[PDB]
Amino acid sequence: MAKVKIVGILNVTPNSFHDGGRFVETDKAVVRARELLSQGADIIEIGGESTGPGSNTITADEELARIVPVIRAIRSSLPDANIAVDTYKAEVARKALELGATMINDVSAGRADPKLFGVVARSNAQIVLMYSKDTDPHTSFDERQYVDVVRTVYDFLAERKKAAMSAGIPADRIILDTGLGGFVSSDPQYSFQLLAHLSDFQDLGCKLFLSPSRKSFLAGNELLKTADRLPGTIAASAIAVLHGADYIRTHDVLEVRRGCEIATAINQPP
Amino acid sequence: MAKVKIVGILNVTPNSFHDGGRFVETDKAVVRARELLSQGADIIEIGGESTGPGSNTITADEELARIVPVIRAIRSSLPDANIAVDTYKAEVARKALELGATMINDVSAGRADPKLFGVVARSNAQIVLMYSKDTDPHTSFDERQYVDVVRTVYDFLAERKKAAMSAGIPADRIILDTGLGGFVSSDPQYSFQLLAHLSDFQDLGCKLFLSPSRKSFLAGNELLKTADRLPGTIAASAIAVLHGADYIRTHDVLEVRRGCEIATAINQPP
Numbered sequence: 001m002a003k004v005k006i007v008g009i010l011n012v013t014p015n016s017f018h019d020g021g022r023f024v025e026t027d028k029a030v031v032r033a034r035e036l037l038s039q040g041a042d043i044i045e046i047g048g049e050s051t052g053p054g055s056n057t058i059t060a061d062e063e064l065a066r067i068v069p070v071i072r073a074i075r076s077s078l079p080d081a082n083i084a085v086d087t088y089k090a091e092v093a094r095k096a097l098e099l100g101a102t103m104i105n106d107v108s109a110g111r112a113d114p115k116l117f118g119v120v121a122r123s124n125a126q127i128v129l130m131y132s133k134d135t136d137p138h139t140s141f142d143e144r145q146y147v148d149v150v151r152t153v154y155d156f157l158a159e160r161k162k163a164a165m166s167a168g169i170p171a172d173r174i175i176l177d178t179g180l181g182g183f184v185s186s187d188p189q190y191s192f193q194l195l196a197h198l199s200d201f202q203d204l205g206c207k208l209f210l211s212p213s214r215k216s217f218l219a220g221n222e223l224l225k226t227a228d229r230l231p232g233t234i235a236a237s238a239i240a241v242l243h244g245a246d247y248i249r250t251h252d253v254l255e256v257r258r259g260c261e262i263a264t265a266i267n268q269p270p
Numbered sequence: 271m272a273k274v275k276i277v278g279i280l281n282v283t284p285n286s287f288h289d290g291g292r293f294v295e296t297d298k299a300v301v302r303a304r305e306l307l308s309q310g311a312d313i314i315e316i317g318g319e320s321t322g323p324g325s326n327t328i329t330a331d332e333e334l335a336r337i338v339p340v341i342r343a344i345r346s347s348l349p350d351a352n353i354a355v356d357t358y359k360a361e362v363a364r365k366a367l368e369l370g371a372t373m374i375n376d377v378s379a380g381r382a383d384p385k386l387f388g389v390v391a392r393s394n395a396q397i398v399l400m401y402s403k404d405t406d407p408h409t410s411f412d413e414r415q416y417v418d419v420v421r422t423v424y425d426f427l428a429e430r431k432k433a434a435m436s437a438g439i440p441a442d443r444i445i446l447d448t449g450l451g452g453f454v455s456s457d458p459q460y461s462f463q464l465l466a467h468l469s470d471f472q473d474l475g476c477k478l479f480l481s482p483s484r485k486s487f488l489a490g491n492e493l494l495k496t497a498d499r500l501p502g503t504i505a506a507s508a509i510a511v512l513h514g515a516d517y518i519r520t521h522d523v524l525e526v527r528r529g530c531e532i533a534t535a536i537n538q539p540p
């Protein structure tokens with residue numbers, strides 16, 4: 001059984017407000033991609049629009065203005081790099097694929113932009129379909145309750161896979177993500193239940209993709225801030241791999257790679 | 271489902287027994303004990319004789335000269351702390367129990383000293399019986415092979431539990447440890463198989479105790495040295511808890527506690 005593919009998060013978020021222009025943010029992104037690769041990332045995932053807590057929506061033009069220089073610079077300086085883009089906007093995905101990205105990660109599962117499925121279908125790229133409790137990726141993180149969150153998410157992902165296939169994406173280019181954290185509920189129990197039952201989602205026939213990545217459900221009893229959730233991220237990501245994850249999305253490539261290697265080894269027979 | 275109990279390692283083997291100082295400074299050990307407690311250790315485990323790579327045997331007299339001052343200082347400045355002692359020697363355990371230790375951790379599983387079982391039986395302390403491929407804790411770490419390491423270790427622990435009980439120790443005071451790292455084999459695959467099948471040991475009726483703690487089986491494909499094994503230790507300890515460990519022994523108390531809390535949460539039913 002194979003190693004997990006580590007997806008290193010590269011957020012392009014211009015919020016410094018100083019004398020330097022867009023080039024400073026682009027240069028920051030390139031140094032960060034080099035570091036992620038140094039730490040053993042298999043894939044560099046570029047995102048121009050945060051969907052974390054308290055985030056809001058940007059225009060497609062602003063999102064392209066952020067990620068296009070970055071993709072260009074990484075492709076030229078690091079041509080071996082495997083590039084993914086985190087976007088739910090068809091116009092953003094189309095340009096990113098033309099510039100050499102090979103993976104599109106859609107937190108809306110193709111629901112925010114009905115044209116995105118066709119953009120990926122006409123390419124050679126893979127698509128990540130993630131479960132979210134609402135169609136809008138920037139909905140507030142309410143305390144959503146579930147009678148059976150595993151069944152709810154499973155039925156959702158089955159439906160979205162069938163829609164992606166009807167739009168022309170073959171099953172072997174579809175990757176599935178249960179969602180975690182606020183995407184599921186501000187109540188952490190449901191994220192833990194998806195992690196406990198993650199192997200069930202292998203019956204949909206698709207590779208699995210997870211992003212524990214210091215999310216709110218890892219706050220624990222101490223209600224840890226983001227900066228203190230690295231131990232919890234390592235544990236959650238290792239257990240996800242133990243239960244079938246093929247991709248792990250993370251800010252902390254070195255540590256999460258090494259932790260998930262242990263999970264992979266525990267999964268091996270003699 | 272209860273939290274794991276975190277056993278914080280306080281090893282007071284001196285830097286260089288023969289070349290430098292004969293003992294550690296007692297106040298520095300107390301400082302470390304206070305940090306382990308403040309990081310969330312439930313138990314402080316004092317040991318005067320190390321058993322990792324290349325360790326040296328020491329006499330019972332010298333072992334007492336190491337741990338007695340440190341136990342006395344901790345019981346005076348931290349009387350609420352739970353004390354365990356890591357020793358395979360009956361005369362060390364006897365004095366440790368007199369001074370208030372409530373758990374004896376024996377890496378020989380009661381084999382190295384025929385009197386140890388009886389000393390523990392005449393106390394109210396718990397005893398940890400760990401599997402090792404050889405009785406002598408300082409045996410070199412050979413590449414021991416197994417046809418079925420789970421079966422071998424299971425039958426060993428069943429036999430040591432029966433021996434402890436024959437010596438008057440009740441089953442509800444017996445704690446079992448599969449061993450990890452060189453205690454099992456210099457081949458890491460056998461330590462991963464024990465972790466993968468740890469739930470098989472719940473048939474024995476005893477709480478389970480594990481010490482991933484930056485051991486050699488966490489070296490991975492990079493053949494990481496001790497300093498780089500914290501992520502793997504978090505992942506292995508978390509997975510051990512997910513698979514039924516009741517105690518986790520570590521010197522990285524803060525991080526391993528937080529990671530293991532995630533494993534406990536994933537184990538909880540809706």
Ligand SMILES: Nc1nc(O)c2nc(CNc3ccc(C(=O)O)cc3)cnc2n1
Binds near residue numbers: 052141181
């Ligand atoms: N495929 C996939 N899977 C994710 O889990 C994901 N998460 C984020 C970032 N969004 C969040 C959402 C919630 C939280 C919190 O509750 O803390 C944090 C970050 C962005 N892209 C993502 N893509």
Ligand SMILES: Nc1nc(O)c2nc(CNc3ccc(C(=O)O)cc3)cnc2n1
Binds near residue numbers: 320400453482
């Ligand atoms: N109950 C229990 N369980 C242990 O696992 C343990 N380990 C050590 C320390 N000994 C070792 C042995 C092997 C290795 C390596 O291969 O790296 C490292 C340290 C000391 N007390 C212990 N007690």
